[model samples]
Target: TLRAAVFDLDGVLALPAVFGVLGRTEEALALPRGLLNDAFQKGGPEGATTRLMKGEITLSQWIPLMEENCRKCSETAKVCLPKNFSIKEIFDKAISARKINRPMLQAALMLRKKGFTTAILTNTWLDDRAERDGLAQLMCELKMHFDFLIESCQVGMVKPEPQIYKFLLDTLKASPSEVVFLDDIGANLKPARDLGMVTILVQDTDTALKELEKVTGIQLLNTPAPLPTSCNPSDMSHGYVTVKPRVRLHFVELGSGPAVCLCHGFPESWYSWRYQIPALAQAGYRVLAMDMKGYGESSAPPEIEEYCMEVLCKEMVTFLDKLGLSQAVFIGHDWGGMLVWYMALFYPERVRAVASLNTPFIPANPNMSPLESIKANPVFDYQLYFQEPGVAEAELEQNLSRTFKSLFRASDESVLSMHKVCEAGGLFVNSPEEPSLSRMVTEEEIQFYVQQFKKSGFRGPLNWYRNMERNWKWACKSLGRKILIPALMVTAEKDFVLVPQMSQHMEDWIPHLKRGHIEDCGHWTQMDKPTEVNQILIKWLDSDAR
Candidate 1:
């Protein structure tokens, strides 16, 4: 019945948490005082833990340095090894000191017996499975009671923090009051106490047994001592939280001679147009790939005010003004398709030629959400889910592989899917029941994602969705404006997110629009189907979209 529980292997259930027995018994079994002193002077346990977790020290350096320090301590104590005091003997003695917590074990089993949840809480250093094998052996030997054994070193988290407590609560599906926590450390106990959970600390075998008996109403087979409102740890680690923008923005600039702008759709960045950048620059056109406010490498601000289409449209114009360019080619893809079309209507003279990709330019309609325009589409569900707070980031971050795998679909299939979804709204909402990290998302790639994400995380990117209503309102302000430019709209025939119907009303908005579809690509027109995208964009930029 237990949803989640964690156990500490050493001291409470085994000899100690250290890796080696002899090394720990004769020497300090825990972190060196000197290391603590240095870290305290530097930035405390957090700094030390970070370095240790990241494996900053090679074993060669660590082993010899530790040996020298232990030798120095032994010399200072003016003690030679006792005649019978072998390292193994010392370790056995240390292990002997860890009295069996029979009452506590009974209580845990009692909880389980009563259909209540239980777990083990301990602070142990992380090690290989071989090292853990001994603890597992000890657990079986002692008939230890624990549902989950959580080692801080393994998980990169420890007790006495809300994150760990929250982690437990979340995992267990148990409310704060529904559970009780038992630990041997006051520092660890206090965190549970603060969370309003019943807590008991085990000081020594005698007191611990008595306390466990008292709390669980179970008779203790052995004895342990008992042990706080507040006492700062001589060294304590602090919690960390990641901050991210609501939207992820990218500013893309391509070409060299005259300034020209290009915008990509949802799920794209300036990287989308790998072909256009070089192609335009070669043709003496200054090309720019604008990471739309949310897709890539751009400011993902939290406010809806930042996402208004008018604000974004103005941002593009201002982007050029900031660059000292008077006028340039304005290109749009998918949502960007709508963006450029709006750009032409708002500032007709600023756009030399309007290049739209898989998106039709149409007058702003106050009565619609982008999804409502294409309700019959499959991928459209994603947009609706994205509209909910925190939903998109979760889905994207968790199933990054699936999303990436989806990226590998046939280019045209991807395009067709995109077209339906963008036109229809949210697509593929929970259609795939179980999260199929179904494809191979390499470890290296996962590491890359984790690192890039740890830099700031996904919140910044989600801000783009927050801006939709504002963008709609902004567009509606110039409802009847017409786009007048040599416009070219390229749609990938296989783009699953944006498709053919997306270009339904182009002539009404951009009278000069030219539409083209590539045969084998998806939403990632330039990346997946780059050759065709390159040819079309090159011809257009040179002819008129230039």
Candidate 2:
């Protein structure tokens, strides 16, 4: 009969340790212990507490009222509290103490898997714009874990009110008797119990979890909790949006406004766009950086044909469509750049503009497959080695960190030397030694890549190289197709493979192409010269051509 389980967020899901920072408030404003809570409890129907939670009063408006209330209470006390209160200072301290209660989280996860609708009902208030925006990242992570989330400030109602409980029951379309509500506060639970719902007062998180297990007859203590696969906003607050069902492409979305989709190259993840994302987001554009298929957190299909240029192109189109965007400025790096060129050919309508970093737009030549063309050139003989299965996979997987080190070598003659070693059947000339990252990237950044590849393996990524011939065969349909969309290309001066000359004749085929070059830079243009790259992109994206 039970259809859903509801949770109180602060004390039930995450510890309500706002009091842990009481010392901070006492030291800052010379306020007494429990002075803040005393003001909230004493504040009447028209007071700061009610007005703040109800969204009728802003943080600035409520701070003065709190100061006044503290002063009034201190008039009859031994130590009078200070008049001035820094809301920002004390609020930040409280937020810093908030951490997830794992036992409660695990219990909720278990209930969801057992076919119960799990929801978070929280009585929370946001005092400032930053805290309000911060809720987006918090809710994004919570939404990924729970079924539905109902917040008090946004809904114009707080817990302990019958209307709020009725709203949850009505949305669920279930009777009160079929709902299980858990909360830490006594007053909040009393209302739910009165509504005929099973109420559990939370004190010891593990004990509360055990009680839920016994009542529902579902074992929850041993359930394996879900581990985070991608970087969330806490790492910097990036939001994840999953597109498509057959092959879900997980993308990191930041900011809001006109969308600009960033496609990362092979052997790279959304992390590759770390620097650019914040810049673009700050410049007033919704930035979407995706982990291409067979890379990062995106689904990697086992089939070889799945990595074809045409399939990759279709995925990009579908990715935009699923996100409810009809058109977006598409930017790619390396192989990602190659795919966007084809995207302009295969699905021109979906692209408002296109950009490439390092890679050039080369019109297909019917003379031979891409592999054959590369094999004829001595510099690209490494393609032949990557074409063979198990050869590169075995070598790359053997020591991920070392291989990444060699693969991400500086944009110099050393990069060419490393390729020659691979061309001659060696994975890396310096096999065992973990070479230092280029000055552009940090050791911590490389470790993020190393740890990710350790779990997913290299076969999926290597498969992208293995499909060059197939991609060439598939892309023959668009050989003479001119990319009609406005385009931009940022070439690294020292890039070994995609030299500036490779993109020289791009204007011949791409009618509207703008070019910028980063001096003394290598293959990793964005990471190597983030500020210059961002300036070039912002100029292009803001221009009338876009």
Candidate 3:
């Protein structure tokens, strides 16, 4: 078993930004693109760049050395820079581009939580006194999650050297085989591997974390933060409730206070709320995460007429009736978000409070169906396509894994763009060249969904869209009716599907409404920013305490 974990800083815990910035600087200064790296490496083993990492020189001093070296090494006989460019400005621009790699840091955090000594062993020229970007600064963020920090500038040692490995072992108090080391460079990793410690080369962080998990036997990236001990979503109990004759909703039940029902949106299951369930349950509420009709282990009635908002919303209340609960807080995301909003209007008494992640009520238009009114917009084309029964089912079911990987992305301007989705002519068409799982979800989660859809198919979920006109008519009668219960509308900054502006008038419809926003998020609001969503949900729930 591994008792200690070590990570290199640049390109491991933090991404390397200096080289790219230098290239861009060369571009702006009219120097050749590859000149910077070539010039720096031209200094041989005792190069200025190596000296900078080994603390033999300062960044202020390395630039002038590289300038002269660049002048000498240029094959085209060009000068190092545009005669007038300041070295300080060029480096400041590069340093500011430094980025922290979150997934790897999250893996390190997981190791620390699992009773392992976690440390950063980096070859950095960081000053012990510097405040802007020093060990103290990194510690305030990712380093805060680690147990120790070993900087070459402070420790008088640089990696790829066996002495540094020995120092780390002595400091961590673990044998070589008891520790696992990760670095971007094979040269640096070879020393650690030769010392008998497990070694992983981090070419890409996403795959790097996977290797760490295999070595440590801990699920790292999937659960970045430890769940509150009172309730682990992984340990939640499962039960089935037959609300409609053909529809038996499968729900994951946990905790022991007044219930908070979680309804997930289209193309997703209760797993979408995997982050929030533990959070809400631990914060004093009985959590019920349901695999809404037509998804997961739940029954998927084939007929389009079965999925209209009013019908689906009514069964949700009937679901409560079967569970022997009088009322509970109702929360939904995406399609589920619309369902809960309609529940507030259709079955008001059953709802204790309401919260929605991305979707918001666009006060019903009696003249035209919601889908029809929005049909002029190209982004709504996917929903329009879903209205036809056989077409979308056949389209989405073509390749199960591809179907989900295509839709469940965080945000890609090209792959996830709503207009791009419509232009592809199908949600799964022109599939992402290399569709990988989003950070918000894991391979297990995607595989579980694929397995669920394999059983249920797309007909049941697509039917919800087919009832566009029916739901419009049903919700139209309650158009002016206020959702008097306390309500929360959480908006995502980048959710093109349900843009933030769509919820701007929510206060008008829900007089008791409270609003919260998550910046840099997509349509999968709950999954994208669960901690924020949980805090927002719990705060509103407490403020309106019954």
Candidate 4:
């Protein structure tokens, strides 16, 4: 019976892919192939690298040695070094690029829960950043699940040496036959196997996991796999975190780079960011698309005051803190666009940059608030309809089929127009037989909204309309202040509610404004122009500047 399971760190748990990344960096810099790997592995098994692994030198000392190794190798090579050759650039990629074997790591954690002890036996250079930096992002998550980390540098005993295995068996308090050891390299596993321990040569993760499961008789591979894609609702991994007491939010977390927080508009959930999530994630961005307070899997309370400006902003800031992210590029559309803009305005520290679709920053008039501003505009009379509370939600939820068909309208129909509302005598009364803009979407899309709105009622979303006056007071504080951070306003030519013309004066308030416009597109900008929207967003996100 196996009582203990031990793992080797570098290749076994964290796939450094040293040769692969080095090959890429070499090709990128126009250097000879495998130059970096050859240089790093200089002087064979007892070289400086092995010494560094044995704690003979710190990372600071290893840098110069590796640099000298690179220079010495490049000098002997046929290809001459360019004057602009940067060994630091090569070293940077090699050190940080590693993919964590998530399934294997999960199995180790499961082993511990099943009364089997877990430990890491790794050969690593003495570097604090191995735990403190991005490399830590690769290794530190592995630390939390195990019983102890027995590092080569910390223990003064390298692997494949019988003494190290003896020490490990001593620490585990188990006989060699009762312990199962895993290592990526052949030599390391040899000594443990010779010591009468069952040894696993880890290569492919699934195969190794399957064998481990049989030996231990405890099933693994049950941890959360990082979400598949938003296109398939069935395969989607929904995440819910309590941002604050009584206010938990459902969000879709994708990718593993700089954070990009996406907020959906009125009556929509995190599902609205379906197209952008995969696109942004593939391009190296961490996308967090949250179901707005009132919709999807979040806490949608009955109180209208809960959805107001100050409360929403504070909740979002606290949400960021809870997730351990200091700042993020906030992206939104429609009502969500308004939220991100306010996020940058009130709490720029938590906002990396702001990109909005179908909405622009509206400057407050000297004396008139947004409530009175809408009162004067007959086209925006729907706001008045939403303020009546129970009446609007009662009528809209009466017929969800008609509700989405009417709202998600054509550029010309301007689904948000008050003329139709005034004609039908309610917000969702006069809907077309089917969406005229179905060419851009599907009946399936409409059904998703219907299914979503069924679980999350109309009041929480309707309360946003109910708060024009309360939000007006909060907007007044930042009236004259220009947004100092990088800002983007994505405008649609046919958005009747939030027209493109509204963004013309945005440069007056946002000094770092970058504008994107899609011709013939409507208020549902991202849905209508997903390719263009993705291009604009990916371009801006990739720009070396903010």
C-alpha root-mean-square deviation, each candidate: 20.9, 13.8, 16.8, 11.3
Backbone-clash count (model 1): 81
Q: What is the C-alpha lDDT of each candidate?
A: 0.55, 0.75, 0.78, 0.80
lDDT of 4 by residue, 99-158 (tens): 777677878877886899889998886674433376654555567568888888777778
Sorting all predicted structures by TM-score, with the top scorer first, yields 3, 4, 2, 1
Higher-lDDT candidate among 1 and 3?
A: 3
Question: For model 1, what is the alpha-carbon lDDT of residue 533?
Answer: 64
- Overall local distance difference test of candidate 1: 0.55
- lDDT string, candidate 2, 12-105, tens digits: 8876645446555665665676666666556565667776776777766776777677667667566665454565667665776676776787
In candidate 2, stretches whose alpha carbon ends up further than 4 angstroms from where it belongs are 1-233, 236-246, 412-419, 544-546
Using lDDT as the measure, the top candidate is: 4
Error of 2 at 30 (Å): 43
Off by over 4 Å in 3: 1-109, 112-234, 412-414, 420-423
Q: What's the true lDDT of residue 67 in model 1?
A: 41
TM-score preference between candidates 1 and 3, better one? 3
Tens digits of lDDT, candidate 1, 199-262: 6565565575566556556455443321100111111121111122233334544335767777
At residue 307, candidate 3 shows an lDDT of 87
Worst 10 residues of 2 by lDDT: 225-234
Model 1 bad stretches (over 4 Å): 1-254, 366-379, 399-402, 411-457
Arranged by lDDT with the best first, the candidates are 4, 3, 2, 1
**TM-scores, all models, native as reference:** 0.47, 0.58, 0.60, 0.59
